[PDB]
């Protein structure tokens, strides 16, 4: 009894090894199954193309009924990800469902890199630039990718 999160995390880890993603990867940090690290590749047609971005993940005690805590540890220019690596994504808060897995979360973050959401922003200056001056947004996102993520 009382191994809800661990059993779920172990099952996700097993499944991940059997049929992993292409654009991202993840796994536990040593013996601590509650602490994972992940990598996301900048999506190919996005201004993040060529970049490699690292993330840290902590699963809560009541996983899968509460969402994982996920943050970037690589700098990225994006309206939903701030300079501390915090991420604003609905499925990490009010739209979490136990149906979601860490692989699905990571793929959703990849989708968010492809298609930022300035209506749920975390960095208002970037949200405004994205919404109204896409050329500038793309150029800055490319420069940040080249400075920090290659
Ligand atoms: Cl159990
Ligand atoms: Cl297996
Ligand atoms: Cl909890
Ligand atoms: Cl665009
Ligand atoms: Cl540089
Ligand atoms: Cl620098
Ligand atoms: Na968008």
Burial class (CB in 10 A: 0-12, 13-18, 19+), 106: buried
Ligand number nearest CA of 147 is: 5
126/92 Cα distance (integer angstroms):
21
> In this structure, which residues have their CB less than 5 angstroms from ion ligand 7?
115
Total of domains in the chain: 1
Which residue do the tokens 């047609």 mark?
45
102/148 Cα distance (integer angstroms):
25
Give me the CATH number covering residue 117.
3.10.110.10
| 114 annotated active-site | no
- Structure solved using which method? X-ray
Structural domain containing residue 52: 1-150
Ligand number nearest CA of 1 is: 1
- Strands annotated E in 11-124: 24-29, 32-41, 52-58, 69-72
Ligand 5 center to 149 CA (angstroms): 10
40 closest CA partner among 117, 119, 116, 114: 114
Catalytic residue among 24, 88, 110, 114: 88
Ligand number nearest CA of 75 is: 6
Which residues, including other chains, have CB under 8 Å from residue 126's CB and lie 6 or more apart? 77, 78, 79, 118, 137
DSSP letter for 68, please: P
């Amino acid at each position: 009894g009382s191994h809800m999160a661990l059993k779920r995390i172990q099952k996700e880890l097993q499944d991940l090894g059997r049929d992993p993603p292409a654009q991202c990867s993840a796994g536990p940090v040593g013996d601590d199954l509650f602490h994972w690290q992940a990598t996301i590749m900048g999506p190919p047609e996005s201004p993040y193309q060529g970049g490699v971005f690292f993330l840290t993940i902590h699963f809560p005690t009541d996983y899968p009924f509460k969402p994982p805590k996920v943050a970037f540890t690589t700098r990225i220019y994006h309206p939903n990800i701030n300079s501390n690596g915090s991420i604003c994504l609905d499925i990490l808060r009010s739209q979490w469902s136990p149906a979601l897995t860490i692989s699905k979360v990571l793929l959703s973050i990849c989708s968010l890199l492809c298609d930022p959401n300035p209506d749920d922003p975390l960095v208002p200056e970037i949200a405004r630039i994205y919404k109204t001056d896409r050329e500038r947004y793309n150029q800055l996102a490319r420069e940040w990718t080249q400075k920090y993520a290659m």
